[PDB]
Design an enzyme around this catalytic site. Structure first.
Site, PDB file in Angstrom:
ATOM      1  N   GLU A 124     -45.557 -63.082 -38.338  1.00  0.00           N
ATOM      2  CA  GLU A 124     -44.387 -63.851 -37.890  1.00  0.00           C
ATOM      3  C   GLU A 124     -44.288 -63.765 -36.357  1.00  0.00           C
ATOM      4  O   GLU A 124     -44.386 -62.672 -35.795  1.00  0.00           O
ATOM      5  CB  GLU A 124     -43.090 -63.351 -38.542  1.00  0.00           C
ATOM      6  CG  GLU A 124     -41.920 -64.295 -38.275  1.00  0.00           C
ATOM      7  CD  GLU A 124     -40.628 -63.928 -38.997  1.00  0.00           C
ATOM      8  OE1 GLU A 124     -40.543 -62.841 -39.602  1.00  0.00           O
ATOM      9  OE2 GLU A 124     -39.685 -64.745 -38.959  1.00  0.00           O
ATOM     10  N   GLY A 265     -38.573 -54.024 -35.015  1.00  0.00           N
ATOM     11  CA  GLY A 265     -38.166 -52.986 -35.956  1.00  0.00           C
ATOM     12  C   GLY A 265     -38.990 -52.965 -37.238  1.00  0.00           C
ATOM     13  O   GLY A 265     -39.493 -51.921 -37.641  1.00  0.00           O
ATOM     14  N   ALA A 266     -39.125 -54.120 -37.883  1.00  0.00           N
ATOM     15  CA  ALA A 266     -39.981 -54.238 -39.060  1.00  0.00           C
ATOM     16  C   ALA A 266     -40.152 -55.682 -39.482  1.00  0.00           C
ATOM     17  O   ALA A 266     -39.500 -56.595 -38.946  1.00  0.00           O
ATOM     18  CB  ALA A 266     -39.420 -53.425 -40.241  1.00  0.00           C
ATOM     19  N   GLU A 268     -40.953 -58.304 -43.024  1.00  0.00           N
ATOM     20  CA  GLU A 268     -40.761 -58.399 -44.478  1.00  0.00           C
ATOM     21  C   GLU A 268     -41.914 -58.996 -45.308  1.00  0.00           C
ATOM     22  O   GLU A 268     -41.660 -59.632 -46.337  1.00  0.00           O
ATOM     23  CB  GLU A 268     -39.491 -59.217 -44.761  1.00  0.00           C
ATOM     24  CG  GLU A 268     -39.593 -60.751 -44.527  1.00  0.00           C
ATOM     25  CD  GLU A 268     -39.288 -61.189 -43.097  1.00  0.00           C
ATOM     26  OE1 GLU A 268     -39.374 -60.347 -42.167  1.00  0.00           O
ATOM     27  OE2 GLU A 268     -38.968 -62.389 -42.902  1.00  0.00           O
ATOM     28  N   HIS A 301     -32.638 -54.262 -44.538  1.00  0.00           N
ATOM     29  CA  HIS A 301     -32.899 -55.598 -44.008  1.00  0.00           C
ATOM     30  C   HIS A 301     -34.171 -56.221 -44.598  1.00  0.00           C
ATOM     31  O   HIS A 301     -34.129 -57.328 -45.135  1.00  0.00           O
ATOM     32  CB  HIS A 301     -33.013 -55.540 -42.491  1.00  0.00           C
ATOM     33  CG  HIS A 301     -33.244 -56.867 -41.855  1.00  0.00           C
ATOM     34  ND1 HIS A 301     -32.232 -57.592 -41.260  1.00  0.00           N
ATOM     35  CD2 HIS A 301     -34.370 -57.605 -41.712  1.00  0.00           C
ATOM     36  CE1 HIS A 301     -32.727 -58.721 -40.778  1.00  0.00           C
ATOM     37  NE2 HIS A 301     -34.018 -58.753 -41.045  1.00  0.00           N
ATOM     38  N   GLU A 302     -35.296 -55.512 -44.522  1.00  0.00           N
ATOM     39  CA  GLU A 302     -36.544 -56.086 -45.039  1.00  0.00           C
ATOM     40  C   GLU A 302     -36.481 -56.286 -46.554  1.00  0.00           C
ATOM     41  O   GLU A 302     -37.069 -57.248 -47.075  1.00  0.00           O
ATOM     42  CB  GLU A 302     -37.763 -55.224 -44.673  1.00  0.00           C
ATOM     43  CG  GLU A 302     -37.869 -54.846 -43.194  1.00  0.00           C
ATOM     44  CD  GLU A 302     -37.695 -56.033 -42.246  1.00  0.00           C
ATOM     45  OE1 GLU A 302     -37.968 -57.191 -42.636  1.00  0.00           O
ATOM     46  OE2 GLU A 302     -37.268 -55.798 -41.098  1.00  0.00           O
ATOM     47  N   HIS A 305     -34.603 -59.512 -47.467  1.00  0.00           N
ATOM     48  CA  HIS A 305     -35.432 -60.695 -47.206  1.00  0.00           C
ATOM     49  C   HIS A 305     -36.152 -61.204 -48.456  1.00  0.00           C
ATOM     50  O   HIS A 305     -36.478 -62.393 -48.546  1.00  0.00           O
ATOM     51  CB  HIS A 305     -36.477 -60.396 -46.131  1.00  0.00           C
ATOM     52  CG  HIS A 305     -36.062 -60.793 -44.747  1.00  0.00           C
ATOM     53  ND1 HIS A 305     -35.440 -61.991 -44.472  1.00  0.00           N
ATOM     54  CD2 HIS A 305     -36.185 -60.152 -43.560  1.00  0.00           C
ATOM     55  CE1 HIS A 305     -35.192 -62.072 -43.178  1.00  0.00           C
ATOM     56  NE2 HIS A 305     -35.626 -60.966 -42.602  1.00  0.00           N
ATOM     57  N   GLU A 324     -32.495 -65.104 -41.097  1.00  0.00           N
ATOM     58  CA  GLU A 324     -32.190 -63.899 -40.328  1.00  0.00           C
ATOM     59  C   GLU A 324     -30.698 -63.592 -40.259  1.00  0.00           C
ATOM     60  O   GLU A 324     -30.304 -62.451 -40.453  1.00  0.00           O
ATOM     61  CB  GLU A 324     -32.762 -63.983 -38.911  1.00  0.00           C
ATOM     62  CG  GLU A 324     -34.293 -64.023 -38.876  1.00  0.00           C
ATOM     63  CD  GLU A 324     -34.933 -62.865 -39.637  1.00  0.00           C
ATOM     64  OE1 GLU A 324     -34.273 -61.817 -39.802  1.00  0.00           O
ATOM     65  OE2 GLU A 324     -36.107 -63.000 -40.045  1.00  0.00           O
TER      66      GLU A 324
HETATM   67  C1  LIG Z   1     -33.505 -56.867 -35.938  1.00  0.00           C
HETATM   68  C2  LIG Z   1     -34.419 -55.851 -36.637  1.00  0.00           C
HETATM   69  C3  LIG Z   1     -34.347 -54.502 -35.912  1.00  0.00           C
HETATM   70  C4  LIG Z   1     -33.935 -55.638 -38.083  1.00  0.00           C
HETATM   71  C5  LIG Z   1     -35.867 -56.392 -36.744  1.00  0.00           C
HETATM   72  O1  LIG Z   1     -36.836 -55.633 -36.736  1.00  0.00           O
HETATM   73  N1  LIG Z   1     -35.987 -57.721 -36.895  1.00  0.00           N
HETATM   74  C6  LIG Z   1     -37.286 -58.337 -37.237  1.00  0.00           C
HETATM   75  C7  LIG Z   1     -37.006 -58.977 -38.603  1.00  0.00           C
HETATM   76  O2  LIG Z   1     -36.254 -59.942 -38.709  1.00  0.00           O
HETATM   77  N2  LIG Z   1     -37.510 -58.293 -39.636  1.00  0.00           N
HETATM   78  O3  LIG Z   1     -37.278 -58.807 -40.960  1.00  0.00           O
HETATM   79  C8  LIG Z   1     -37.954 -59.201 -36.328  1.00  0.00           C
HETATM   80  C9  LIG Z   1     -37.616 -59.313 -34.977  1.00  0.00           C
HETATM   81  C10 LIG Z   1     -38.366 -60.154 -34.150  1.00  0.00           C
HETATM   82  C11 LIG Z   1     -39.452 -60.895 -34.623  1.00  0.00           C
HETATM   83  C12 LIG Z   1     -40.155 -61.676 -33.773  1.00  0.00           C
HETATM   84  C13 LIG Z   1     -41.245 -62.398 -34.135  1.00  0.00           C
HETATM   85  C14 LIG Z   1     -41.852 -63.125 -33.157  1.00  0.00           C
HETATM   86  S1  LIG Z   1     -40.991 -62.819 -31.772  1.00  0.00           S
HETATM   87  C15 LIG Z   1     -39.838 -61.766 -32.467  1.00  0.00           C
HETATM   88  C16 LIG Z   1     -39.800 -60.773 -35.974  1.00  0.00           C
HETATM   89  C17 LIG Z   1     -39.050 -59.924 -36.805  1.00  0.00           C
HETATM   90 ZN   LIG Z   2     -35.422 -60.219 -40.651  1.00  0.00          ZN
END
Ligand SMILES: CC(C)(C)C(=O)N[C@@H](C(=O)NO)c1ccc(-c2ccsc2)cc1
Ligand SMILES: [Zn+2]
Ligand SMILES: [Mg+2]
Ligand SMILES: [Mg+2]
Length: 889
Positions: A124, A265-266, A268, A301-302, A305, A324
């Site tokens: 992603e 962070g992570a 999914e 969170h993951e 998803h 998101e």
């Molecule tokens: C907001 C957090 C800490 C939960 C996180 O790790 N978000 C992920 C995400 O939505 N995981 O399910 C995240 C953040 C940024 C990206 C991303 C991808 C291309 S540029 C930023 C992808 C996933």
């Molecule tokens: Zn997410």
């Protein structure tokens, strides 16, 4: 400068039904073989077949097992593989390719890369095209059959999506594993992992179908003992989705994997969630308290998803907030239910109103569903995520729990297994809205503006009470400032959760009430109101807005003491502080501008200080809440209220106010610091990794907050306490002893002590780095240089770089040194980082987001460094786009 427009969405003229991959990992290269079973779609108009493919080295490509010749039949330019249409078949056909990639030197951490001794993917948003050719967009749904091979000794554990259907030996010390994943998925949910991984496992039995699910959590061998909390959080997440939403996990197995090098962070990936180690691993001996809520949140969170993102997917990336924002909302509900502390909701509001409000009033401001993008990586924002989450949460506030659950079920039931858009979700909620209002005439068309309109609405109030009629009125006005996205702003559907507090006895005067503001202004009248109330407005922070309560400090104090709602109490305190801060700021500013020899400052309201004392001394009151009331609002919350902010003057302002309060309450602070020790630092469950007590952690938060206050104040013999504190088994405590010791000559002594405690755990050392970076030291620049030379060096680990630099950028007085040297320092780091990791370079830009809100000298300094960065010949597209938008070019 290719700009993509939301309005331009067209389905592809092609279809990809099946993906068959062979990923062969070797010492110096990885060879990727791919067969795509494709078709022509109804939208096809005879166009060239164009694949995404970034940085791939082509060995060969074919159509129906016929080799294609470069130049006459195709062109590749390291970004797009173009196959001239006359060579594209007109029915079902097979495209195949073999490319070479190099995860060992992939320091951008997108696509396939090496993290320490683990090979891992991150696809992603546009990472899959860095692994093999594809029509790399989320509406291209396909089946996946993936084989991975590798040196068996170095990579004994092989993982991908779906079921492992074969395992086999290969001559030369190699082995392979084959994974088949029949359900359709977008390519950004593809993942692969290879490494010497150790695990913990458990079995979960689903609630209604009683299906057995195998849960595995993986890390490198050294940290396998840190996996236990993650596994407990996963069980919790599964149970919560079952209990609140009625949703069971649909697969046989779920794998979570921790890696040391990770941009976010992570992620999914279906059945294979991959985590930044700092968001999966903890132990009580080697982690600060915050890691426990962080892991809970991110694992949750993951997991959420799997429905909102994975089973219901996105049509296009412009719908990003649909998965998101909705998943952050689900994560917040989960976390509130798990922690059972009011500080959990407060911490999310605190984050939004500082960081996201700053973004939304900056030149980067965008709606949660943007109309266009250049670099999709720049759209994963606190706006899309956290404002998104608040917009998703407002549906629940408007509908209530029962009809929200009915609406959510409609959404899932009507979109499960397909792509969706924000409109689909609004539609489902609208059906619930009709049912609740009991007339098919009701609609939520106005609600859609929450998706399309940028900027933070301002909501203001005026009140009237007629004692003879027992009649109360709340007149409400809403306003969003025009910006570069909309010249004219429209009124939003704003849900205002309210109560009315009787100021004589502190009791509720009316039942739970959500006012529906749908106009620019409205007047809400309440009959049979026995006495003039104090209004309790936007309870639970019921809309993501600037609240202007127009209450006196006396009224705010009364709410702070007696209101039922944690947020309104917290906000009333916030509002009292802001009035004081703005007043003292202007007094200091005027003195500075006019070069006054003497002047007066408005003292802190004495009844306010009295109220703080009252709450602090109440044994039944919450320790976490208490920690909020003795803290001034975040600098990034404050700056939204001040033009041309002189950071020096704000630093002086904060110092005056803290001193005023401390001069009255320091004895109370000390007394509490001592009395909280037994419960806060209780070691009973220190060796039980599944026993997490968020109340106790809040007590430590309070103690450490108080200790900081007492240290800055140079409270008599406090250094004694600091020294004892450093001997505590809890890293939140002994790392706190390092940062509060900054005000004493014992700092470097504790610097060395805590370094030795931290150095042998990768994540703990990173927390040590943050602690040093954030230390209130006059020699912080020299200290940073020491970190660079002695610890950070040329590490490309994003956790290391972010730890060393970001906390420092919140040092109001030092980062904003009038010489501009702090700005010059971070810009150098951004430019250096951008050579190998554009994503993290853009993250490291965060300090610059407020640049046009500062005094004119600092504006100029920041702008110079940004233009300097923009002029770097080798600047990435990611960083260039970000800075171009941030500097309004
Ligand atoms: C907001 C957090 C800490 C939960 C996180 O790790 N978000 C992920 C995400 O939505 N995981 O399910 C995240 C953040 C940024 C990206 C991303 C991808 C291309 S540029 C930023 C992808 C996933
Ligand atoms: Zn997410
Ligand atoms: Mg390459
Ligand atoms: Mg390392």
């Amino acid at each position: 400068p290719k700009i993509h427009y939301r309005k331009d969405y067209k389905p592809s003229g092609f279809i990809i039904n099946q993906v068959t991959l062979n990923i062969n990992i070797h010492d110096q290269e990885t060879i990727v073989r791919s067969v795509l079973d494709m078709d022509i779609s109804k939208h096809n108009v005879g166009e060239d077949l164009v694949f995404d493919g970034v940085g791939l080295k082509i060995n060969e490509i074919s159509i129906n097992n016929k080799k294609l010749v470069e130049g006459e039949e195709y062109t590749y330019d390291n970004e797009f593989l173009t196959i001239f249409s006359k060579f594209v078949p007109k029915s079902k056909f097979a495209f195949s390719s073999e490319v070479i990639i190099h995860p060992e030197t992939n320091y951008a951490l997108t696509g396939l890369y090496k993290s320490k001794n683990i090979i891992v993917s991150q696809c992603e948003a546009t990472g899959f095209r860095r692994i093999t050719f594809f029509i790399d967009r989320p509406d291209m749904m396909a089946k996946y059959d993936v084989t991975v091979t590798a040196d068996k000794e170095k990579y004994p554990v092989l993982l991908s999506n779906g079921d492992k259907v074969n395992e086999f030996e290969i001559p030369g010390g190699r082995h392979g594993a084959r994974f088949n994943d029949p359900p359709l998925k977008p390519c950004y949910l593809f993942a692969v992992v290879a490494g010497d991984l150790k695990h913990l496992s458990a079995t979960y039995i689903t609630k209604y179908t009683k299906k057995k699910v195998e849960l595995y959590v993986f890390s490198e061998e050294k940290y396998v003992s840190k996996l236990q909390w993650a596994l407990e959080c996963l069980k919790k997440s599964m149970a919560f989705d079952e209990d609140y939403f009625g949703l069971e996990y649909d697969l046989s197995r779920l794998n979570l994997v921790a890696v040391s090098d990770f941009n976010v962070g992570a992620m999914e990936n279906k059945g294979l969630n991959i985590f930044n180690a700092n968001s999966l691993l903890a132990s009580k001996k080697n982690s600060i308290d915050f890691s426990y809520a962080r892991i809970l949140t991110v694992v949750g969170h993951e997991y959420f998803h799997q429905y909102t993102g994975n089973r219901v997917t996105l049509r296009d990336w412009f719908q990003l907030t649909l998965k998101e924002g909705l998943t952050v909302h689900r994560e917040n509900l989960f976390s509130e239910e798990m922690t059972k502390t009011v500080t959990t909701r407060l911490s999310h509001v605190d984050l939004l109103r500082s960081v996201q409000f700053l973004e939304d009033s900056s030149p980067l401001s965008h709606p949660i569903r943007p109309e266009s993008y250049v670099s999709m990586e720049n759209f994963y924002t606190t706006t899309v995520y956290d404002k998104g989450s608040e917009v998703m949460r407002m549906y629940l506030t408007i509908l209530g729990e029962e009809y929200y659950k009915k609406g959510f079920d409609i959404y899932i039931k009507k979109n499960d297994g397909n792509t969706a858009t924000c409109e689909d979700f609004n539609y489902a909620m609208e059906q619930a809205y009709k049912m609740k209002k009991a007339d098919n005439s009701a609609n939520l068309n106005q609600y859609l503006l929450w998706f399309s309109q940028s900027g933070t609405p301002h909501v203001s109030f005026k009140y009237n009470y007629d004692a003879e009629k027992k009649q109360y009125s709340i007149h409400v006005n809403q306003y969003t400032k025009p910006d570069e996205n909309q010249k004219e702003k429209k009124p939003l559907f704003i849900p205002i959760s309210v109560g009315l507090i009787n100021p004589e006895n502190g009791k509720e005067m009316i039942s739970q009430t959500t006012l529906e503001l749908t106009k620019e202004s409205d007047t809400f009248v309440f009959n049979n109101i026995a006495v003039k109330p104090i209004p309790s407005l936007f309870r639970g922070f019921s809309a993501p807005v600037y609240i202007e309560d127009q209450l006196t400090d006396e009224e705010r104090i009364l709410l702070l003491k007696y209101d039922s709602d944690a947020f309104v109490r917290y906000n009333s305190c916030t509002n009292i502080y802001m009035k004081q801060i703005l007043m003292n700021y202007n007094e200091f500013l005027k003195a500075k501008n006019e070069k006054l020899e003497s002047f007066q400052l408005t003292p802190v309201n004495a009844q306010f200080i009295d109220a703080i004392k009252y709450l602090l001394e109440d044994p039944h009151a919450d320790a976490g809440f208490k920690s909020y009331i003795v803290s001034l609002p975040q600098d990034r919350y404050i700056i939204n209220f001040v033009s041309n902010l002189d950071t020096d003057v704000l630093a002086d302002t904060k110092e005056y106010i803290y001193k005023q309060i401390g001069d009255k309450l320091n004895d109370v602070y000390y007394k509490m610091f001592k009395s909280l020790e037994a419960k806060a630092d209780d070691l009973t469950y220190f060796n039980d990794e599944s026993h997490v007590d968020f109340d106790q952690m809040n007590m430590r938060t309070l103690r450490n907050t108080l200790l900081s206050l007492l240290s800055k104040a140079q409270y008599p013999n406090i250094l004694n306490e600091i020294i004892e504190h450093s001997k505590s088994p809890y890293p939140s405590n002994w790392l706190t002893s390092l940062s509060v010791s900054a005000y004493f000559d014992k700092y470097f002594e504790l610097y060395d002590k805590t370094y030795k405690l931290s150095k042998d755990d990768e994540l703990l050392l990173q927390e040590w780095l943050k602690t040093v970076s954030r230390s209130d030291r006059k020699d912080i620049y020299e200290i940073l240089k020491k970190l660079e030379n002695e610890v950070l060096k040329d590490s490309k680990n994003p956790n290391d770089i972010r730890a060393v630099y970001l906390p420092f950028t919140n040092n109001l007085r030092r980062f904003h040194d009038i010489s501009g040297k702090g700005y010059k320092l971070i810009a150098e780091v951004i430019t250096k980082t951008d050579k190998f990791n554009p994503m993290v370079a853009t993250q490291l830009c965060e300090p610059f987001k407020l640049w046009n809100k500062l005094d004119t000298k600092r504006q100029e300094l920041m702008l110079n460094e940004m233009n300097t960065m923009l002029q770097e010949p080798q600047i990435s597209n990611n960083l260039k786009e970000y800075l171009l938008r941030l500097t309004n070019k």
